[PDB]
Design a protein around this ligand. Structure first.
Ligand SMILES: [K+]
Ligand SMILES: [Mg+2]
Ligand SMILES: [Mg+2]
Ligand SMILES: [Mg+2]
Ligand SMILES: [Mg+2]
Ligand SMILES: [Mg+2]
Ligand SMILES: [Mg+2]
Lengths: 223, 136, 49, 132
RNA sequence: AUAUACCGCCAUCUUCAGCAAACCCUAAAAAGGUAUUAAAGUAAGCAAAAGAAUCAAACAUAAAAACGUUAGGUCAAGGUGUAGCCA
């Protein structure tokens, strides 16, 4: 009874890669999708210089070795959150990828907000949605900037509500408030398409893993 | 009751502190996960500052040794009349073949850059590549 | 018995001569009087639908 | 500005009833008449006497049920019968209401020389149409 | 006696378009809070609008018109605070 619930929720945290997210991606796979391409040196943010491999003739290059480490942590965290039945909200304001990100969220079983973000959505949610509205347990920022080249309002507002954020941060982005930054290209369709696939497979695996874990432990109770 | 102070500490440190005080009675579901698999860096606020005086960034300009050869090829012959295909991961351009042959001759032991530049042109001419020495 | 018969019966049993018809007695199906979709947009767990 | 029978706006904390909310120009449109007799119909007499009886009957009911009236009373005259329909709060014990009905009926039947009946609908508390 | 204590019932701007409250946000706020290919504002009230009346329909006409402004008018419609008269 109590042991079974403890087994479902406490066993996954005893393994470094319980969901085996390492196999989903590789440095070569990230390099095919152009995840190492950054903005020009003029557009560089000071807090991104740790993640930049160098400047290839004006174009900053993003170290895909750090990206693999950071992406591993971000995908693992996104899986445990999905495993525990937490709410995940995908957030972006890039209009080229608005439909793709809404289709990804629907496939995963999660939520997407690709439209204009209303002031107070998270800090004043009760007024907007209702008295007992449950806020997201994790926000994945495929894009952390709005269309005026400023931080998306939900980056600061998610920190105010103590919501962890998994965000894709490029050379011009500010990762300081992103809990799990993933340094990489956010503009190329092939880069965004790869990230959307990784987040969707990871979330579906964790949800499937929970179902199987529940059946095994549940079956043991009669058996 | 919470700590909507996103400039002091981090989401995890503020959640740890609120529970110690006695205000937050139930752990968030993401808390235990963060404790077991934290991020590499703590997500704490920092005000971006500008550099002044003689402070400079530390970004290495990416220049391989082939670039010395490639620069000469573009100055002497320009870009190959064949168009670059940047979708083929194993594409070999006319310039990259020039640099592959130039390297082979240099392995043999030729020490003169002038010798390696004119000999490579002759070898590619035998291959049939159309190299136009366009000064224009 | 239908919606039309209901409205006719209510008009006989509760004759009102108020000019505005929104202010007259009504026994309509709840779908009409109430707004169509004020229902909860999430379940017991709190996950939106 | 018109000040007649208009419960003016406060700051959203004043509980007005349906009758109080509507100004005089909504009579016969959204709200009806509290008294119904035949004395103001065309070619009918004794409007003055029916109106005077109404004024008294309202002051009598307020004093006889002090603080126990949730809304204005409704007076209905049919033939020589008078019927008083009052919404009354459930403050007083039940047996006390039976006393005031027996008293107020007999007293007003010997004062106006008509059969008078009192109809009381008890509410748990005043019904609020809107907060203005 | 006091409309310069008021209620009640009104005039005036006026068929002018505003008045008031609950939240949220700011490297602090003396204040401010908009961008639609959207950048912090949101969600409810009162007025306007709509609706109803002039017994088809429209238009028109009435009605409606908040908060304030003029210590505006009215102690003599009635009621009433304070002061005054009681052979
Ligand atoms: K006055
Ligand atoms: Mg970018
Ligand atoms: Mg005055
Ligand atoms: Mg005067
Ligand atoms: Mg009309
Ligand atoms: Mg109107
Ligand atoms: Mg004066």
């Amino acid at each position: 009874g109590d042991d079974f619930q403890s087994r479902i929720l406490d066993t996954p945290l005893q393994h470094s890669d319980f969901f085996n997210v390492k196999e989903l991606f590789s440095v070569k796979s990230l390099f095919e999708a152009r995840v190492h391409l950054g903005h020009k040196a003029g557009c560089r943010h000071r807090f991104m210089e740790p993640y930049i491999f160098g400047n290839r003739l004006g174009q900053d290059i993003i170290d895909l070795d750090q990206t693999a480490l950071n992406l591993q942590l971000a995908l693992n965290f996104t899986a445990h959150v999905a495993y525990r039945k937490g709410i995940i909200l995908f957030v972006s304001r890039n209009r080229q990828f608005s439909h793709l990100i809404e289709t990804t969220a629907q496939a995963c079983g999660e939520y997407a907000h690709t439209r204009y973000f209303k002031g107070g959505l998270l800090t004043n949610a009760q007024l907007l949605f209702g008295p007992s509205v449950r806020l997201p347990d994790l926000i994945i920022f495929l894009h952390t900037l709005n269309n005026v080249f400023e931080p998306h309002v939900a980056v600061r507002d998610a920190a105010k509500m103590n919501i962890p954020t998994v965000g894709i941060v490029d050379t011009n982005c500010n990762p300081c408030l992103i809990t799990y930054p993933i340094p990489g290209n956010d503009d190329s369709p092939q880069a965004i398409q790869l990230f959307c696939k990784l987040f969707r497979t990871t979330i579906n695996r964790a949800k499937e893993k929970r179902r199987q874990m529940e059946a095994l432990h549940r079956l043991q109770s009669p058996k | 009751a919470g700590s909507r102070l996103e400039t002091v500490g981090s989401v995890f440190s503020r959640t740890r502190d609120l529970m110690r005080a006695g205000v937050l009675k139930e752990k968030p579901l993401w808390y235990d996960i963060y404790k077991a698999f934290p991020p590499l860096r703590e997500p704490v606020f920092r005000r971006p500052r500008l550099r002044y005086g003689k402070a400079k960034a530390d970004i290495q300009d990416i220049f391989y040794q082939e670039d010395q050869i490639r620069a000469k090829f573009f100055a002497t012959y320009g870009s190959g009349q064949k168009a670059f295909d940047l979708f083929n991961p194993n594409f070999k351009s006319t310039c990259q073949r020039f640099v592959e042959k130039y390297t082979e001759l240099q392995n043999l032991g030729e020490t003169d850059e002038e010798k390696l530049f004119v000999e490579t042109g002759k070898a590619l001419l035998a291959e049939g590549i159309i190299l136009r020495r366009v000064r224009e | 018995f239908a919606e039309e018969d209901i409205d006719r019966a209510i008009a006989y049993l509760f004759p009102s001569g108020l000019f505005e018809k929104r202010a007259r007695p009504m026994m309509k199906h709840p779908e009409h009087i109430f707004p169509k979709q004020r229902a909860t947009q999430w379940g017991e767990d709190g996950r939106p639908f | 500005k018109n000040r007649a029978a208009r419960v003016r706006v406060a700051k959203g904390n004043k509980p007005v009833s349906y009758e109080e909310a509507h100004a005089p120009h909504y009579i016969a449109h959204r709200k009806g008449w509290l008294s119904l007799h035949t004395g103001n119909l065309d070619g009918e007499d004794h409007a003055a006497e029916r109106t005077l009886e109404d004024v008294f009957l309202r002051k009598f009911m307020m004093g006889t049920f002090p603080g126990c009236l949730a809304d204005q009373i409704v007076l209905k005259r049919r033939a020589n019968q008078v019927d008083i329909c009052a919404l009354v709060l459930r403050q007083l014990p039940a047996h006390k209401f039976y006393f005031l009905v027996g008293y107020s009926e007999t007293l007003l039947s010997h004062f106006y020389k008509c059969p008078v009946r009192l109809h009381l609908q008890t509410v748990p508390s005043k019904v609020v149409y809107k907060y203005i």
